[PDB]
Subunit: 260 residues, 2 copies
């Protein structure tokens, strides 16, 4: 009936209280992490605006970098598991999450309940990840966040052959030398990364709803390319900081249920 | 009994006359290619120092970029096939060739006769190739050919984790920043490429004699690393320009044999 979720970074602490797995009754965030007052201060804020007693919280689950440091807790669950679980709380019927990171990319398949089932990670190749985008940006002397908008007014599209990052880093200088329209080039870089991650998506199997996450997911152009490529509408929602603790309160709630 | 082999680049022309598939009776090279006098001038030189007549040459085989341009020829065979065939003529009992190129790497398996059987190419990834070496060199501000010798006096060995070129390009700047001994770092870069190509070698199957070819093969340090890694003595011979035509004269000779 009343469960708690804690997420303890190294730089921040976050917590959620959740009635009947349906109602966030309180939430808090503090800019202090593992080994500080931060997590204590989250609890005060939660217990104080609710008026509840420790006996009222049936289960606590904690996640985050410092989750192994924290004792008064019924369970420790991964941030990957937890975080996703919260994302589905935000967009129900989510079954496929796409996290293009700065140095990695992961596709996650989920339960009818929003619980991680299996997933694929790329951490070894620079292509089809964030850094692929740093590189190309530096070459045409532009800022990475300025990128998604340039690509809007594409008229043709610079098609690339190179799949490797290095090779490609030449191939755009060759298109640059000729002096093609940047909205054509940026459209063909986006297509690169899109084609890459698409393969991971292909292997794991699409199944809507399909949500996109990460810093890279704000690049509107990457999102379109990705959509066109997997052939499915893609949701890019706004995910709040307290999404990890949220997922934890949810797991802390499957758990309260099983005691009975 | 007397066969001829022609190799016609875009910048050069080369030819060989070969008695009984055993004796190079004459050879010539001219710095002019496809669409010039070059190939005519090779023939004169061959026919003139031999004193032979066109009737005496039983079969001609031609290979090279411009092999499709040349008519008076019994056959056209690939340069890959031909070139290897000659290398075995230089190092008998060769069964495994390793060509680390500037932008690619290939491992070739050969016949008991020195005839290509099957092979594996990497052309898509920058790691485990020439360019992997350009990159790292630029970073520590050194010339690529100066490389193999630095690595001789290695005392420890900078171990790398990154397999991707980009990722690694950071990882050496991190070892550089700390200021480790270059002979340790260069020893761990060599180990990178070595580990890469080793996989291709592993997949295709080692079988001596094992010969190493390419510009990259002069880097003595790469050769050691490669040896240690595949666990087999490696021959780095000196391969003359007229190796392609040589292999062609050899194929032109399996061919003379079959008419009878
Ligand atoms: S695909 Fe490996 Fe890029 S360097
Ligand atoms: S492995 Fe190097 Fe791909 S960008």
């Amino acid at each position: 009936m009343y469960t708690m979720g804690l997420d303890i970074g190294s730089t921040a602490s976050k917590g959620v209280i959740l009635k009947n797995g349906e109602d966030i009754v309180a939430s808090e965030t503090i800019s202090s992490g593992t080994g500080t007052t931060g997590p204590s201060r989250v609890l005060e804020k939660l217990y104080g605006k609710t008026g509840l007693a420790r006996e009222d919280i049936k289960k606590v689950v904690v996640t985050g970098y410092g989750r192994m440091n924290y004792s008064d807790a019924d369970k420790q669950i991964s941030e990957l598991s937890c975080h996703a679980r919260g994302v589905n709380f935000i967009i129900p019927e989510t079954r496929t999450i796409i996290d293009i990171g700065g140095q990695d990319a992961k596709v996650l398949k989920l339960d009818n309940n929003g619980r991680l089932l299996n997933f694929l990670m790329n951490d070894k190749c620079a292509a089809g990840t964030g850094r692929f985008l740093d590189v190309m940006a530096k070459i045409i002397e532009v800022d990475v966040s300025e990128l998604g908008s340039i690509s809007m007014n594409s008229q043709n599209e610079v098609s690339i052959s190179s799949t490797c990052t290095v090779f490609a880093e030449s191939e755009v200088i060759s298109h640059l030398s000729e002096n093609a329209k940047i909205e054509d080039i940026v459209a063909g870089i986006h297509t690169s990364v899109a084609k890459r991650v698409s393969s991971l998506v292909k292997r794991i199997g699409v199944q809507r709803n399909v949500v996109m996450v990460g810093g890279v997911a704000r690049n509107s152009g990457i999102v379109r390319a990705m959509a066109r490529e997997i052939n499915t509408e893609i949701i890019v929602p706004d995910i709040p900081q307290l999404t990890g603790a949220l997922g934890a309160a949810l797991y802390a709630f499957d758990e309260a249920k099983e005691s009975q």
